[PDB]
Amino acid sequence: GSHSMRYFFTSVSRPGRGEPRFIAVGYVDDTQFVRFDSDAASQRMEPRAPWIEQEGPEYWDGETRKVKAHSQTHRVDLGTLRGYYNQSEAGSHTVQRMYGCDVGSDWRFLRGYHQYAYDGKDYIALKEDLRSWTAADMAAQTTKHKWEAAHVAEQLRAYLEGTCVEWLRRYLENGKETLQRTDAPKTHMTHHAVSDHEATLRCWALSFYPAEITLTWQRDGEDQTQDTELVETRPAGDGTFQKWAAVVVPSGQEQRYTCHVQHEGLPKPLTLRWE
């Protein structure tokens, strides 16, 4: 199957109250494996998945040094950005960064990513060809120019198509029991009386992995929509995910509706009918 590795970085300035709050987290597909929190006692990159603990001291010392370097750069970025936008030295601002790679079913490089956001808005992003940048405003243009001269894209391309993919494969193997698995959803339907004229039918999908899933309602065959409510897929806390889809139906007509579940772990789509 296809897999991905992603690192997410968030740095928030808190002027007058010490250094910015920096949080870094690493993911392989839908499971987190490492984190770094500037406010944590350790001040070390820390494991968030037992399988990453198979990496030795050199890994942890090396990743700790590199994550602190990322923290340091973002600390400077916050200063640079407020300067770029002529903002007050007393306000709180946020810089976010994400980068990573995807591999196809062959586990060979598929695509790479490297982008930034300032105060919740796109700032600059590496394009798909991994050779050009996408800058929004004037400020981002300044950054772009600097990165082009510093050959940042060239170094990222080498990483994304090389080290990134190679280590992703290493992780996939070292944590195969959890990463290369598929947990089919456990499904059931609930009924909720809303009035003596109608009721809410809710289709649940629980304990599934990966997070990708499709839940849809149909009536006597036709596809229901706009009448169906969906919630964002959410974490159960045990490494698995949940999701539900609902539809308001007229009392006595419940059995006319059907829920359809599509998931990687299901040999074939599921169909649930109430009662």
Partner: peptide
């Protein structure tokens, strides 16, 4: 594994 080249905006 993390990218090892420090980058500044």
């Amino acid at each position: 594994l993390l990218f090892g080249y420090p980058v500044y905006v």
